[PDB]
């Protein structure tokens, strides 16, 4: 699990979104595994605005941050899961690293701030849902 909190926005894996998230829906994209909901408290996180392909992500199944190289956000075929059928996930970034289902919502960070959140894994790869394109998260 895990979320990004920026201004009055909460960014979560669409597949981990609660009833409060859906009751306070701002925007959801099933093909990206993202849902944003509205919050009352002000969030302290900064979204990266950049095209970094290096950063650090939190891996809850190792209680460890790992530095990774990651591919630019693209449309990648992702196999069926405990939460989805096999489909093209959009705006997805892969790196070589450890990811289990419960690692979803781990944050990937570069020097500019938050890049995205763990969304996919398996076969020694970790997939991160990019958020850097969502400029509206910052006003
Ligand atoms: C077989 N497979 C794809 C996994 O166990 C997996 C790994 C990480 C993740 F975030 C989601 C899943 Br589903
Ligand atoms: Zn960056």
């Amino acid at each position: 699990s895990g979320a990004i909190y920026v201004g009055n926005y909460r960014v979560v894996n669409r597949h981990l979104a609660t009833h409060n998230d859906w009751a306070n829906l701002v925007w959801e994209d099933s093909s990206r595994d993202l849902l944003v909901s509205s919050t009352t408290a002000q969030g302290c996180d900064t979204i990266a605005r950049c095209d970094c392909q290096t950063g650090v992500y939190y891996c809850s199944s190792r209680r460890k941050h790992y530095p990774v190289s990651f591919s630019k956000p693209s449309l990648i075929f992702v196999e069926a899961s405990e939460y989805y059928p096999a489909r093209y996930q959009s705006h997805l970034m892969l790196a070589v690293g450890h990811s289990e289902p419960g690692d979803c919502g781990g944050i990937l960070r570069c020097q500019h701030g938050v890049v995205g959140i763990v969304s996919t894994g398996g076969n020694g790869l970790v997939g991160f849902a990019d958020v850097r394109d969502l400029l509206w998260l910052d006003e």
Side-chain angles (χ1 to χ4, degrees), residues 60-126:
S60 60
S61 69
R62 300 282 182 263
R63 291 173 186 136
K64 218 169 282 295
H65 305 260
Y66 297 99
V68 284
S69 295
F70 55 87
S71 66
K72 287 172 143 152
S74 66
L75 193 69
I76 300 168
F77 190 84
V78 175
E79 299 295 315
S81 71
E82 174 62 39
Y83 289 102
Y84 288 107
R87 60 99 152 74
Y88 288 100
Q89 180 161 330
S90 58
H91 294 263
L92 186 63
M93 301 170 295
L94 297 181
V96 176
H98 193 58
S99 183
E100 285 172 38
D103 291 326
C104 283
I107 292 161
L108 171 69
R109 294 184 178 268
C110 66
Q111 64 260 52
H112 306 102
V114 170
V115 174
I117 51 159
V118 172
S119 179
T120 71
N123 286 356
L125 304 174
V126 46

